[PDB]
Design a protein around this ligand. Sequence first.
Ligand code: 6FA
Ligand code: 6FA
Ligand code: NAG
Ligand code: NAG
Ligand code: NAG
Ligand code: NAG
Ligand code: NAG
Ligand code: MAN
Ligand code: MAN
Ligand code: MAN
Ligand code: MAN
Ligand code: HG
Ligand code: HG
Ligand code: HG
Ligand code: HG
Ligand code: HG
Ligand code: HG
Ligand code: HG
Ligand code: HG
Ligand code: HG
Lengths: 546, 541
Amino acid sequence: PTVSATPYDYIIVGAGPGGIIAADRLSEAGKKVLLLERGGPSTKQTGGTYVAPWATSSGLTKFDIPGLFESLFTDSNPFWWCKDITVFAGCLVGGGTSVNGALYWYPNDGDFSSSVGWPSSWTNHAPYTSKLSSRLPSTDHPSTDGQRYLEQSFNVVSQLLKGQGYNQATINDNPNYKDHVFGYSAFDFLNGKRAGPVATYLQTALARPNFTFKTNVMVSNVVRNGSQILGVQTNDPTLGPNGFIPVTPKGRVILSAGAFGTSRILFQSGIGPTDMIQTVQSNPTAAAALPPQNQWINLPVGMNAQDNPSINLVFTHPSIDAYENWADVWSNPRPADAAQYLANQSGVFAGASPKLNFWRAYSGSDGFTRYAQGTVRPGAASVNSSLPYNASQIFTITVYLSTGIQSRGRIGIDAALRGTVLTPPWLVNPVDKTVLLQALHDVVSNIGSIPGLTMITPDVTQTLEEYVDAYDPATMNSNHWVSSTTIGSSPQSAVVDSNVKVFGTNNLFIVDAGIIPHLPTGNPQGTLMSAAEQAAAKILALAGGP
Amino acid sequence: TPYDYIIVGAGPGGIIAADRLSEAGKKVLLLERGGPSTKQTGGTYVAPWATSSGLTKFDIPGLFESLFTDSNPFWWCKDITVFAGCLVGGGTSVNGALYWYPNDGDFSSSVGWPSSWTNHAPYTSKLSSRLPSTDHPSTDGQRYLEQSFNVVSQLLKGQGYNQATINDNPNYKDHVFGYSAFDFLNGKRAGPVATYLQTALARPNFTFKTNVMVSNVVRNGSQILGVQTNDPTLGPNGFIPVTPKGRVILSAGAFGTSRILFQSGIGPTDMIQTVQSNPTAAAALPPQNQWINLPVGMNAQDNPSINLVFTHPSIDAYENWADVWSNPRPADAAQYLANQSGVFAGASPKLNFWRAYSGSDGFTRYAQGTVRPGAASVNSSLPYNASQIFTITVYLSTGIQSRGRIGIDAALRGTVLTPPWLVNPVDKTVLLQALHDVVSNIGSIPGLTMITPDVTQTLEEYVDAYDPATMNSNHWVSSTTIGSSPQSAVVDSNVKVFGTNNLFIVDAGIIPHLPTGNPQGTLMSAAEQAAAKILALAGGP
Ligand SMILES: Cc1cc2c(nc3c(=O)[nH]c(=O)nc-3n2C[C@H](O)[C@H](O)[C@H](O)COP(=O)(O)OP(=O)(O)OC[C@H]2O[C@@H](n3cnc4c(N)ncnc43)[C@H](O)[C@@H]2O)c(O)c1C
Ligand SMILES: Cc1cc2c(nc3c(=O)[nH]c(=O)nc-3n2C[C@H](O)[C@H](O)[C@H](O)COP(=O)(O)OP(=O)(O)OC[C@H]2O[C@@H](n3cnc4c(N)ncnc43)[C@H](O)[C@@H]2O)c(O)c1C
Ligand SMILES: *[C@@H]1O[C@H](CO)[C@@H](O)[C@H](O)[C@H]1NC(C)=O
Ligand SMILES: *[C@@H]1O[C@H](CO)[C@@H](O)[C@H](O)[C@H]1NC(C)=O
Ligand SMILES: *[C@@H]1O[C@H](CO)[C@@H](O)[C@H](O)[C@H]1NC(C)=O
Ligand SMILES: *[C@@H]1O[C@H](CO)[C@@H](O)[C@H](O)[C@H]1NC(C)=O
Ligand SMILES: *[C@@H]1O[C@H](CO)[C@@H](O)[C@H](O)[C@H]1NC(C)=O
Ligand SMILES: *[C@H]1O[C@H](CO)[C@@H](O)[C@H](O)[C@@H]1O
Ligand SMILES: *[C@H]1O[C@H](CO)[C@@H](O)[C@H](O)[C@@H]1O
Ligand SMILES: *[C@H]1O[C@H](CO)[C@@H](O)[C@H](O)[C@@H]1O
Ligand SMILES: *[C@H]1O[C@H](CO)[C@@H](O)[C@H](O)[C@@H]1O
Ligand SMILES: [Hg+2]
Ligand SMILES: [Hg+2]
Ligand SMILES: [Hg+2]
Ligand SMILES: [Hg+2]
Ligand SMILES: [Hg+2]
Ligand SMILES: [Hg+2]
Ligand SMILES: [Hg+2]
Ligand SMILES: [Hg+2]
Ligand SMILES: [Hg+2]
C-alpha cells in the first residue's frame, strides 16, 4: 500500500479523562503525541452541534449544559453511547466526562493507600491531586452568580442526616473527612458549563504543534512483535498504510479506551485470558490480526472488575420540586430557567441533577471498613408504589458502597466482540450485602422525625431486605468501572506495573480507570484524573522512552 | 393539522399502508423515528469507493455484510436489545433482502389467519408486480461469487433435491434449492422505499416526516385521538390529531409497536405497570380502569437459526466480507460503479433450500437453509484455510410450535422476555434431524469439511452449547397477532386492535406464524391485504 505514516513518540488511544490528561502532560513535555478517539465531537468547542431548540443562539450543546445531564438518558437517538458495549460508556470526545453527572471528588489519602492495591510509589498522590485541582477547581456552587438552585432535596435530606449525627462540610475542602459528612454536590465545571478535561487539558494540548488529535478513528489492536509494540491498527487509511500508525523507535502506545474498550483492544492484541483471546480468534477477520499463539500474553484483563452496588430509594416531601422529572429540559424547559442560563450561565441549568452527597463508614465482620455514599437528586427514574403519590414531590437517594468492598466481577467480550459484563460484580461478597442493608436501614432510621417525608419505593408494604433481593442486579450498575486492568506487582494478579506498563511488553501502557485497583470513596473521576496526572509523570520519568 | 391516517413507522408495513391509503385519496401522515437511508431518501453514508455514485451502504446489496462490521452503526434502534432497523425503510433497508413470495400455506387458516385472509393471491400479485423477484440481480443478468452455490448444490443433489427458480412456483418448496432471490431493482436495494414510498411521496395528500418518535397514542377509552410525538412543530406539545373518523396505524415493528401499545395502556398488566413505573411515562397513560388487556408481546415467534461452517477448496470467502466498505477488490468496485453489475449487485446469500419434516406432534415443519461465502464465527480445534470458509444457516419455519415473549424492561427498552427458540421439544428434535440430514452425505463430496462444529463435537452437543440469543433470525412475528378473539390475539380480521374504535396494526406483529421463507415477502403481501381491509371497513375517513 503507499500511505507513509507519521510516527509518534506516543499514540494514545481514547480521548476520555485518562487519555486527554496523558496527552496534555506528555505533549507539554515536548513529546510528539497522537491522540485517537473513535467517536465524534461533544461540546461546542470541540465542534459539537447537538443543541437544544431553546439553546440555538448560544450553540451550547447537550454536553455543555450541566442541567441537560438527565436528558442524556431520555433522548430518542443517543448517539453518544458506545454501540458495541452492553452497558453505558461514552464514545465521543471526552468519553464518560462528556456524559456523566460530573460529580467531582478529589481523592482522599485512603484512595491511594497501598492497602487497596497501589504500589508504594503511588501513595503520595497529593502533588498530582494538586496539579488537578489547579486545572479543575472544584465548585459546589457552579452557577456563575454563586447562588445554588433547586436545592429543596438538599434541604430535606440535610435535616434527616443531622438527626443521624452527620455534619455539613464543603466536601473538597478536606477530602479526608468522609465519615458522617454531607455537603452540596461538587462538580468540575467552569463558567457554569461542563468543563473537565475537554475544556482544560485538551485545550492546552491542541495549542501545541507537537500534538495531533484525530476523531472518528477506531483502534482494533496494537501491532506487536512479542513484547515490542510497533504501533496501532486503525480503521483510517489516511493516517498510515492500511490504517497502521507506527511509533518512533523508542515510542510508546498508551491505551486509554476505558474499561471495556481497553480490555477489547488487549484481547484483540493477544493480551488477556485465553478464553477471551479465543473469543477473538473465533472471528476469522480479527483472528488474522492476532499474533501467533506462542506470543499471547496471559494477563487478568477484565478480571477483578469492580463497580459500586447502587440502590435507589425514592421519597416524597411536600417541599420538593421534582422539576418535571427532568422530562422537559431539552424540548420545553421552564422559560425563566432557560433564559437565565443563556444570559449568564447561572440558575438550575448550571448544575447537574445531584444536590446533596453524604458518606458513612461501617465496620465489617471480615475486618474491612466499608464506606456508603448517598447521592440525592430531585426526580426519580423508577417508582414501584402500591399507594398514590404526587409525582411533583419525588426525589431519589441513591446509596452505594465504595471503599473497602470485597466484591469483584468480570468484564470481557462476547462472540460478537461486544464489551460486556461476564460476571456481575455487585454483592458477590456476602458481607458487602449485609453492610449495604445496614446502610439503607440507617438512611431511613429517622424518617418519622421529618414531617411530610414518605418513602415510596420501597413502599410501606415492602421491606428493605425484600427490596434488595428483588432488585435487578444489572440496575445496580453505577457506571464506575475500575480494576479491569489493575495496577499491581505481579502478572498473576495484575495487568500493569508501577509505571502502568503492561506486563510482557516493553512499551505498552494503560492510563484509564482500569488501572485503579479498588473503587475510591466517592464517584471515581476525581481519583482517575489524579491518577492520570501521576501516570503521566511516571511514564515521563521511565527511562528508555522517546 | 389533523390527518385521516397517521401511520407510525416507515418499515414495509407502514410504507405499503401509506401508499395504498394515500392512493385512495385519504390525508395520510407517515412518521418515522429514524433518518434517511438510501440515496433517494437523502441518505449520504457512502463508501469511499462508491462516492461518485452517491449509492449508500443501504443501496448497494454487496455492502449488506458491512452493516454488521461498522464501528458506528447508527441504523440499529438504540433502545431495542436485538437488531431492528430504525431508519427510512426499517428492516428492509438493513436486511439481507431475501425475498420469497408467500405460498398458500403461509396464509392458511390452519396457521391462524382468519378465513377472509386466505385468498392472498390478489395481494401477492400486487406486490410481485411492484417488486418483481430476481435471482440474478446484477444488471448484466450474470451471477457472481457462486462457488458456495456450486458446492452445496452437489451436496443437495445427493440428498434428492432438485433445482428450481424458487419464486416461479412458491407452493413447492420441499426438496427444492435455487439461487437466492431478492427484491432488488437495477442492481440496487429496492423494496418499499424504492417503489411504494416513491408513489406515495408524489401525492399532495401524503406527508412523510422523519426523525419523529411516537411515544404513545392518545386515547379517551376506545377512541384514539391521535399520537404523541417528540416534535413540537407538528402539533401542540407534539400531539398530532386524527380527523373525527380518522385512524392510527401502528407499523413500528415487533418491538416498536408493542412498546407504543404498552405506553398507551394496551397490553398485559405487567408491561403496562412497567411503563407506569417510569413517572414520566406514567403521566401519559390512560387511567387503569381504561387499560385494555391484550396479549401484546405474547406469542412471539422467530426462527431458530443454527450456523454450520464448512471449507471446500473451490470456495472464495471474499475476505470474509471485511473489506467491502473500506478496501474492496478493485475490479468488483469498478464494475459496480460503472453499471451496477457484479458481486456488489447481490447480498451475501447465494443458495437457498427447503425441506419438509413430519413432527411427532402432527405438524409438518419446514427447514430452510441459506448458504453464503464467509462465516461470522468459527470454533475449530483444527487448522483451516480462512479463504475457503462458507456458512449454511439452517432454521425451521412453517409448522414450528415454539412461542416466546417480547416486551419492555424497566428502562423502557424493547427486549426479549422469553426466548422463543426451541421452547417446544419437537421443534428441537426436528431441527437436529434437519441438521443431521444436511451433513449426511458430506463424505461424498470431495474436499468438503465441516469446521464448526468440528469433528470433536456432535451436532447434539453443538446445539446444546449454542447461545440461545444467537439463534435469533431477526424474523419476529406474532407479537400482535391477528385472530378472532382478544383472549388469544391483538387485532381482528380488519387489523383493528380489540377494544378500540380506530387503532390498527400493519407490521410483522400481526402475522400469526412464521412463513416458510424469510418473512418480508409475506409481510408485504399481508400489508397489501391489510390496507384493503382497512379501506373496506365502514365508518372510516
Ligand atoms: C458512563 C458514566 C460514567 C460516570 C457517570 N457519573 C459519574 C459522576 O457523576 N462522577 C464520577 O466521578 N464518575 C462518573 N462516571 C464514571 C466516569 O465518567 C468514568 O469512570 C470515566 O469517564 C472513565 O474514564 P476512562 O478514561 O477510563 O474512559 P472513558 O470511557 O471515559 O473514555 C474512553 C474513550 O476512549 C474511546 N475509545 C474507546 N475505545 C476506543 C477505540 N477502540 N479506539 C479509539 N477510541 C476509543 C471512547 O470513545 C472514549 O471517549 C455517569 O453518569 C455515566 C452515565
Ligand atoms: C433486522 C433484519 C431483518 C431481516 C433480515 N433479513 C431478512 C431477509 O433477508 N429477508 C426477509 O424476508 N426478512 C429479513 N429480515 C426481516 C424483515 O426485515 C422484517 O421482518 C421486517 O422489516 C419487519 O417489518 P415491520 O414493518 O414489522 O418493521 P420494521 O422494523 O421493518 O420497521 C419499523 C419502522 O418503524 C420505525 N419506528 C419504530 N418505532 C417507532 C416509533 N416509536 N415512532 C416512529 N417510528 C418508529 C422504525 O424506525 C422503522 O423504520 C436481517 O438480515 C436483519 C438484520
Ligand atoms: C403535588 O405537590 C405539589 C408540591 O408539593 C403541590 O403544589 C400540588 O398541588 C400537588 N398536587 C396535588 C394533586 O395535590
Ligand atoms: C413492587 O412493589 C411490590 C409491593 O408494592 C412488591 O411486592 C414487589 O416485589 C415490588 N417489586 C420489586 C421489583 O421490588
Ligand atoms: C372522553 O370521551 C367521552 C365520550 O365522548 C366523553 O364523554 C368524555 O367527556 C371524554 N373525556 C375527556 C376528559 O375528554
Ligand atoms: C487457501 O485456500 C485457497 C483456495 O482454495 C488457496 O488458493 C490458497 O493457496 C490456500 N492457502 C494455503 C497455501 O494453504
Ligand atoms: C468449541 O469447539 C470445541 C471443540 O473444538 C467444543 O468442545 C466447544 O464446546 C465448542 N464451543 C461451543 C460453544 O460450542
Ligand atoms: C499511496 O500513495 C499513492 C501515490 O504514491 C496513491 O496513488 C495511493 O492511493 C496512496 O495514497
Ligand atoms: C504526520 O505528521 C507529520 C508532522 O507531525 C506530517 O509531516 C505528515 O504529513 C503526517 O501528517
Ligand atoms: C513517509 O512519509 C511519512 C510522512 O509523510 C514519514 O513519516 C515516513 O518516515 C516516510 O518518510
Ligand atoms: C399541518 O399541515 C397543514 C396542511 O396539511 C398545514 O396547513 C399546517 O400548517 C400544518 O403544517
Ligand atoms: Hg447526531
Ligand atoms: Hg480518608
Ligand atoms: Hg527520553
Ligand atoms: Hg456524488
Ligand atoms: Hg451518520
Ligand atoms: Hg405450500
Ligand atoms: Hg369482543
Ligand atoms: Hg372483557
Ligand atoms: Hg366479550
